[PDB]
Design an enzyme around this catalytic site. Sequence first.
Site, PDB file in Angstrom:
ATOM      1  CD  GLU A  11     -11.451  15.078  19.428  1.00 32.38           C
ATOM      2  OE1 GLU A  11     -12.145  15.276  20.417  1.00 32.38           O
ATOM      3  OE2 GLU A  11     -10.244  14.604  19.483  1.00 32.38           O
ATOM      4  CG  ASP A  20     -11.605  16.154  27.608  1.00 36.42           C
ATOM      5  OD1 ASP A  20     -11.776  15.903  28.775  1.00 36.42           O
ATOM      6  OD2 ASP A  20     -10.421  16.274  27.085  1.00 36.42           O
ATOM      7  CG  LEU A  32      -7.336  20.857  26.696  1.00 40.93           C
ATOM      8  CD1 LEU A  32      -8.328  20.087  27.530  1.00 40.93           C
ATOM      9  CD2 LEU A  32      -5.907  20.455  27.070  1.00 40.93           C
ATOM     10  CG  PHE A 103      -6.365  16.687  17.212  1.00 43.88           C
ATOM     11  CD1 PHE A 103      -7.549  16.519  17.920  1.00 43.88           C
ATOM     12  CD2 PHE A 103      -6.192  17.828  16.426  1.00 43.88           C
ATOM     13  CE1 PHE A 103      -8.445  17.580  18.037  1.00 43.88           C
ATOM     14  CE2 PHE A 103      -7.137  18.844  16.442  1.00 43.88           C
ATOM     15  CZ  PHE A 103      -8.282  18.697  17.230  1.00 43.88           C
ATOM     16  CG  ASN A 131       3.159  -2.396  21.239  1.00 48.02           C
ATOM     17  OD1 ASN A 131       3.321  -1.165  21.262  1.00 48.02           O
ATOM     18  ND2 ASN A 131       3.645  -3.213  22.177  1.00 48.02           N
TER      19      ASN A 131
END
Length: 161
Positions: A11, A20, A32, A103, A131
Site C-alpha cells: 500500500e 488510489d 480509503l 483489506f 482460479n
Amino acid sequence: MNIFEMLRIDEGLRLKIYKDTEGYYTIGIGHLLTKSPSLNAAKSELDKAIGRNTNGVITKDEAEKLFNQDVDAVRGILRNAKLKPVYDSLDAVRRAALINMVFQMGETGVAGFTNSLRMLQQKRWDEAAVNLAKSRWYNQTPNRAKRVITTFRTGTWDAYK
C-alpha cells in the site's frame, strides 16, 4: 515478516490525500476515505477519522494509528460466517494473504471469490491460485495480485522477500 510489513509494502505510505488505483481518495497506509469525487468530502472524512481539522495532511503516527485500526477491523470482518470457516482453516501465512485481500477489496469485493475461497478451504493451492487469477482484481492490479497469489500457493513469504 508479518501482516503489517506486508501491507506496508503493498500500500505504501502517503501523508497527504491521494487517489488510489481506482481513483478514490485515500491517505496513509491504504486508508480509503471516500468513494465520492469531492475532495471536500474527503477532507471532511479525514478530519472525522483523525479527530481534528487536518487540511488533508496527517502525521506518520496518525497514519500508523489508522493502519492498526484498519487491520483489526478487517480481522473482525474475517469472523463473518462466510469468511470465518475459511480463515480458521488456514495456516498463519495464508491467513495474512486473506487479510490483505479483504483489506484491499472489502467484504463486498471478497464476496465474488466464493469459488476460490472454497478451493482454499480445501487446501487445493495450485488450483486456487489459477482460479484467483481469473478476476478483475488480477487484471487490474496484477503485481500485487501475484504476490498475494504466490503467498496462498506457497504458504511462504517468498514473494515479499
